[PDB]
Structures are given as C-alpha cells and as structure tokens.
Structure 1
Amino acid sequence: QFEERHLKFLQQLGKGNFGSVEMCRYDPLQDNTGEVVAVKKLQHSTEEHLRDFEREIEILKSLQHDNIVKYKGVCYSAGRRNLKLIMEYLPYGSLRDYLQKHKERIDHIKLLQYTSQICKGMEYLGTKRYIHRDLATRNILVENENRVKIGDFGLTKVLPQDKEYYKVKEPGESPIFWYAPESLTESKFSVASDVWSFGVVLYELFTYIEKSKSPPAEFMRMIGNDKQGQMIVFHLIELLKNNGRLPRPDGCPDEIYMIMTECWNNNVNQRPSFRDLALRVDQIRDNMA
C-alpha cells in the first residue's frame, strides 16, 4: 500500500536483533502533510529472516487490540526486495526508556495500569494461540501516559494445532534472563513460558529500570560473576532449579512480589493464566484507589 518513494526517513527509533525501526514521514503529496509512521526493516535480509519477517507481518496484521501496536501496511521495492513493515508511530517510545526517564512521576497505581494492559494484550495473543517469546519492557511501547502496547513480534510463533508448546532454538543471542527454565533446558515455549517472562516484566517495572537491578545484573551477581559464556546458561539453569529468584524490588509490596513468584514457578502447569493475572492486578488497583 505504501510506496517507498514517499517514505521520508527521519531518524532511527530502535534496534533489535537483525532488525530495526525508523521514524519516517509518509508524505505522498510531498507537501509535509503526511503522517509520521514507524517502519521496521531487516538488517540482514536472508531467506530465513525474510520468511520469518513475512510470518511476523501476517501475525501483526491479524491482531486488533487496544494494547497491540497497529499494523498499517507493507512497503517493498524492486519486485519484492527490502520488505518493510509500516506501523503506527507511538510518540513516547519504549516503556523501558520511558519508565527510566519519568521514574519520579510514575507511581505504583500507574505501573499496575500498564501491567493490566500488558496482561490483556497477552491474553488476546493466547486466544490466537500465539506465543510471544520476547516479553520485556524493551518490547512494550507507550502511546500516551495512560496506554501501553505490545510493540514487537519478531520472535512470536503460532502453536501447532495439536500441541501446547513450540520447540525452537535458532542461532544468535537469546534473552536468557527472561526465559522460563524449560525454555533454557528444552527450548520449549508456551503460554506458560510467556507467563514466566511476564513475571520478569513485572519485576522490571517495579525496579523502575534502575540499572544495577536489571535481571541480567541480579542473575549474574547470584550465579557468580566470573562465569564463562555457555557456563552462564548452565549455572542459570542450576540456579533456577534450586529456586533462586530475582529479589523483591525496592518499595514493591508483598502481594505484587507474590504475583512475580507465582509466575516464576518451576512447574509449568502451576503458573497463573493471563486472565487471572489481570483479575488480581485489577483488584489490587481497585484496593489502592
């Protein structure tokens, strides 16, 4: 739908792994009236990254929800090379950076508003049988002070029709400090591993992204910080099997930490559902108000 000749590059907004998002102005009339959009592209347009990207685009296009970034279209050149995904531009950027920047202005009730919106977005994913696999505040975007959206689906997979998990280990770096144990040991991803990662997201939020308190920093201090490469993963696994966990963040109430710890259950089937997480968060919100 979008012609590349009319996409005006403005700046880079974010970089992932093998991909990036740019702020552009779509201005077909060439009079500086076009709307600003976010444009995702591959940084290395190989076959498997390209088919993965096409599947990611199809996934995003099939999602329509208040807390999921809006698909707008695609843009390609030259036959079909340099495929680009056009999305709505959300003016406050990632929740990670936004929270770190406005920590003094954002109270617990607002954190729980965001938490509730993330849970509702994730529940919608689950109704489509999609596994996000990369839930983290760096992949949540801020539309305004009252609304966040899941903002990236580059690792999202669809469950087999006959199974409740998806096994995949692809080369590169993996956000292992957000991974459920069964994802570390067996590469198994499920709604329940998304729930584990959501618990880490809740931890992130209540740390206010204070950067000695990041999951990587805390876990590395727990496993020993002389650890080596692959050994890290091994030690992390051992840590989680002995019920080592991220600590309660400064100022975090006990009941919120308990939501976290319930999401961090070694037993995959004992983790709460996203609907129950939303109910509990919303009840605490109501109590606070």
Structure 2
Amino acid sequence: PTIFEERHLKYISQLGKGNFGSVELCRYDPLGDNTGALVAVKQLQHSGPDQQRDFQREIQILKALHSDFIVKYRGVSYGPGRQSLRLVMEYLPSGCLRDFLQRHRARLDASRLLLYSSQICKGMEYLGSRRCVHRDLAARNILVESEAHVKIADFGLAKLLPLDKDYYVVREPGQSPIFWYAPESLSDNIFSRQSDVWSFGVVLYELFTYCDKSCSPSAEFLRMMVPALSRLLELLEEGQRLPAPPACPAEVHELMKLCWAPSPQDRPSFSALGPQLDMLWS
C-alpha cells in the first residue's frame, strides 16, 4: 500500500523545486484510464551520493511524522535494489501558503491568519517532540489543504537531534533566502528548534503582510542597509528587526519580537506560543 509501481505513476506537471530536488504532480493510475488519484512525487533532479543520503533521510523522517499539520507521506517508488527513487505524498491542489495569501488576501481576515499561525505552531510543537529541526520554515514551504487548514512540507533539510544534544552545526553555507535564518545560523551555522522559532517569527511576518513583495524581508533589508549576510548579522546584532506589518495587531508583532530574541535560550518554545496564538484567535 506504501509501495508505488513506477509504470503506474503518470507525469502531469512541475509543482516546484529546490535543494537538488523536484516535486511533480503525478496521477497514480493503475487502471491507465486517467481516473486514478493525484499525488505529489519528490525525486532528486539528478543523481548524487550526498543528495541520495539526504533524500533517504528525508523519506525516513517524513514516514515517521503523523500530524494533521504535516504533509502526509503515502509511500515510495524504488530504483535499483533498496535505492529510493521517489517519495510519494498527498497532493494539496491549493499549493503553498505564500501564493495562497497573495491571491486570497481580500478574503483572509486577522482571525484566519491567527488560525494558520496556530496550526503551523502545533505542527512545529509536534516536530520538536520528535527532536526534528525543520531548518527551512517559510510560507513557501507551508501548503494549504483547505480555506481553514495548512500543513508544513519540505523536509529536505530536516535533521533529527541526538538525545543528548539540542543543536547541530552545518559545515557549508545555507542556500535558502538569508532573511529567515537565526543570527547563530548566519554566524556559526548552528541550527536548533530555537532557530526554527526565529524562522516562525518571519512566517508570522509573512502571514500578516500576506507575503506582499513590497514589504518582504528582502525589500525591508535593502531599505534598512560589506557582504549582505554580514550586513544583516550586524543589523540584527544592533537589535534592528522587521517593522510591524500594515494593520498588524500589536500583540502579534510583540510575539514576532519574542521569536526574534537574540539568544536562542530566550526565545519562547512552540508549546508556549501555541496558547498565546489560540488566545488572540478567540
């Protein structure tokens, strides 16, 4: 049931790409009559030993995640031997939250944004409970299941923390837009559940700006600003932060600023954030 035959997976279109991977819309069509269910299918864009090790890790992480707020693992398709060729996941036609916010902004009030915030927070609370660091939390990596339901996706950079260590150090620079990284990530490539909280603060910013490009983190940096990464680290060290989005509830902007505490140990846990978002929502 969790094993998909390659010859039954019919290619339809590209859904997205990044971090050496593509996600394709396929039909799983064993009848070959175009009546089969649609699935989102991730594969490496091209072969590579390091990317393959990372891909098998991603499959093993997502397979073991069971949450209303995490994109659903369906199964795998196999290449030669035990080599995973494709990761088969549920298809969410509404696509990424970034796109959904830009298109439907006139329809989505503060209450709805707080509902999405609460759901992402509950997803991240669960990830933390599994000792999983996402490392790439952003509105582009959150999917819309329905009007009132979002799910976290994109576990391509996710890592499991050992039982005796609450952070990990990456050797090579990140390739994600720099405006979502915590200062300790920008400076020393240190990632933790607390660096995911920093990124969640930027996701709250994205939600309450409806991902408007004109007040994007990039746009704000270029107005607020030496290599860009060093300049951003300097601004953050000075205590400069993204401004309150237009018409943003003061309490929501206060929560963003707590997520952006300079020291990771001073940032609120997702467990602490959850009730505060739920309180604002109702």
TM-score (norm 2): 0.96
Answering whether residue 29 of structure 2 is matched by residue 33 of structure 1, we say no
Q: How does 1:2-21 map to 2 (within 5 A)?
A: 2-21=4-23
Q: Say which of 241, 248, 261 aligns to 1:245.
A: 241
Instruction: Give how far 1:14 is off.
Output: 1.2
Counterpart Cα distance in 2 of 1:130 and 1:172: 18
Match of 1:264 in 2: 260
Q: Say which of 217, 221, 226 aligns to 1:215.
A: 217
Name whichever of 200-209 and 28-37 sits farther off.
28-37
Asked if the contact 1:196/1:264 (under 8 Å) is kept, the reply is yes
Superposed CA RMSD in Å reads 1.3
Distance 1:169 1:101, change over 3 A: farther
Describe the superposition over 1:62-87 as per-residue Cα deviations: whole angstroms up to 9, x where unpaired. Answer: 00000000000011234456711100
Answering whether residue 125 of structure 2 is matched by residue 123 of structure 1, we say yes
Counterpart Cα distance in 2 of 1:55 and 1:207: 34
Match of 2:196 in 1: 194
Instruction: Give how far 1:175 is off.
Output: 2.7
Counterpart Cα distance in 2 of 1:36 and 1:51: 27
Describe the superposition over 1:221-267 as per-residue Cα deviations: whole angstroms up to 9, x where unpaired. Answer: 212xxx6xxx1111111110000111110010111000000100002
Match of 1:144 in 2: 146
Q: How does 1:34-49 map to 2 (within 5 A)?
A: 34-49=36-51
Answering whether residue 245 of structure 2 is matched by residue 285 of structure 1, we say no
Q: Percent identity?
A: 62
Counterpart Cα distance in 2 of 1:99 and 1:58: 31
Instruction: Give how far 1:163 is off.
Output: 1.0
Q: Say which of 69, 72, 80 aligns to 2:71.
A: 69
Is the partner of 2:105 in helix, strand or coil?
A: coil
Counterpart Cα distance in 1 of 2:8 and 2:235: 52
TM-score (norm 1): 0.94
Which runs of 5 or more residues in structure 1 are unaligned? none
Describe the superposition over 1:196-218 as per-residue Cα deviations: whole angstroms up to 9, x where unpaired. Answer: 00000000010011101111221
Number of paired residues?
280
Counterpart Cα distance in 2 of 1:128 and 1:78: 31
Answering whether residue 269 of structure 2 is matched by residue 273 of structure 1, we say yes
Which runs of 5 or more residues in structure 2 are unaligned? none
Describe the superposition over 1:89-138 as per-residue Cα deviations: whole angstroms up to 9, x where unpaired. Answer: 01200000011111101111000100000000000000000100000000
Match of 2:228 in 1: 232
Describe the superposition over 1:160-202 as per-residue Cα deviations: whole angstroms up to 9, x where unpaired. Answer: 2211101113356233110100111111111111000000000
Describe the superposition over 1:127-155 as per-residue Cα deviations: whole angstroms up to 9, x where unpaired. Answer: 00010000000000000111000011111
Q: Which runs of 4+ in 1 moved over 6 A?
A: none
Matched to 2:30, the amino acid is P
Counterpart Cα distance in 1 of 2:119 and 2:95: 16
Instruction: Give how far 1:17 is off.
Output: 2.5
Counterpart Cα distance in 1 of 2:79 and 2:55: 16
Is the partner of 2:140 in helix, strand or coil?
A: helix
